[PDB]
């Protein structure tokens, strides 16, 4: 197999896959990156609001 550097991750979630475009992905779904902070879920991937 091929072992690379770190740019990808893995997430546990049962939410469906949809046809849209959002930079941030959380286990519950996808959230806009417009707002600086977020309260949905701690686990995040990509450009996301800071969790509070």
């Amino acid at each position, epitope marked *: 197999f091929k072992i690379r550097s770190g740019k990808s991750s893995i997430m546990r979630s049962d939410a469906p896959i949809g046809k849209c*475009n959002s930079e941030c992905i959380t286990p519950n779904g996808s959230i806009p990156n*417009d707002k600086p902070f977020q309260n949905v879920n701690r686990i995040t991937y990509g450009a996301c609001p800071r969790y509070v």
Partner: antibody
Amino acid sequence: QVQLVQSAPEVKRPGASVRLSCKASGYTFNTYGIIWVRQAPGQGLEWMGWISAYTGNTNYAQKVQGRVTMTTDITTSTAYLELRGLRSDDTAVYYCARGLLQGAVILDSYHYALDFWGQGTTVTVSG
Amino acid sequence: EIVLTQSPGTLSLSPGERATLSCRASQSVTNRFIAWYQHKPGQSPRLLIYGASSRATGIPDRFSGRGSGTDFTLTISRLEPEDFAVYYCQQYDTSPRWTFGQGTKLEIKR
């Protein structure tokens, strides 16, 4: 629709002064300011100045500060750009476009961009 | 001033191929600024991407803005003949100054 109409092309001489127009339709004039950008032959776009109907305050580019005066008349939604002491490099196509939001705080960047442009006035200055 | 450098200056792609343009800012910019324009020759410039990644009203879904910080990108999926133009980088700052970019030309066809 939101539409911007500009003045007819002008052919001035070096050292003269040219007055350019930008009439606005489809949106209330006081809410947004109008900014002017020019394209010299074989050159990229260059911002020059911004004026607001809500606030007469004007910010001009460093290249043209002493020679540029921008005025606005609410009736009838007409913006004027005056350039004095024209020199050969000033020969360009001058566009106008709606800019900032005035009268309300904003969050969406549409009110921080230039969407509805004019056809553009082509100004040629030569002796 | 803040200087935005576009890349590549000339890009030649075949019709139906994705195209990626890159604009690097001299200093960090909040995604609230940095917008992308299109200038077909002989016509008024058009606004494609406002904000950082938001399509303007009445713009084809293929155009996709993205990026953050110094680097911002515009990606065109399934290039069509309407798309041949010069594309311009833009920023904004508190005292209104709209510093443009040099421009990238799409010399499509082969």
